Amino acid sequence: LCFTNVYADSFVIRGDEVRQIAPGQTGKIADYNYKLPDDFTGCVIAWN
Amino acid sequence: AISSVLNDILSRLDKVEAEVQIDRLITGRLQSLQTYVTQQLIRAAEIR
């Protein structure tokens, strides 16, 4: 594949909160600091 | 679907699960219309 623009969003969270990084979720990371759009396309990568 | 009422589906489920239940009602309703329009087209030929 080729991509027209690519952005890496980089940040750190509590291991419980990784579920809030999927699109359309709820909880204060999804609600108040890192919202993904409902039709997100891209990849979510996370590690300890 | 879990209900025949769109407001029940939209109040009880989130965006991505409600869009799976609403599509069952769209699919079945749209076939309920296509069946009516087909029997009306077939019956209009008898009246003509």
From Swiss-Prot, chain B:
Changing residue 10 to F: In strain: Omicron/BA.1. It comes from the Viruses. Subunit of the fusion protein that is processed upon entry into the host cell. Mediates fusion of the virion and cellular membranes by functioning as a class I viral fusion protein. Contains a viral fusion peptide that is unmasked after S2 cleavage. This cleavage can occur at the cell membrane by host TMPRSS2 or during endocytosis by host CSTL. In either case, this triggers an extensive and irreversible conformational change that leads to fusion of the viral envelope with the cellular cytoplasmic membrane, releasing viral genomic RNA into the host cell cytoplasm. This is Spike protein S2'. The gene is S.
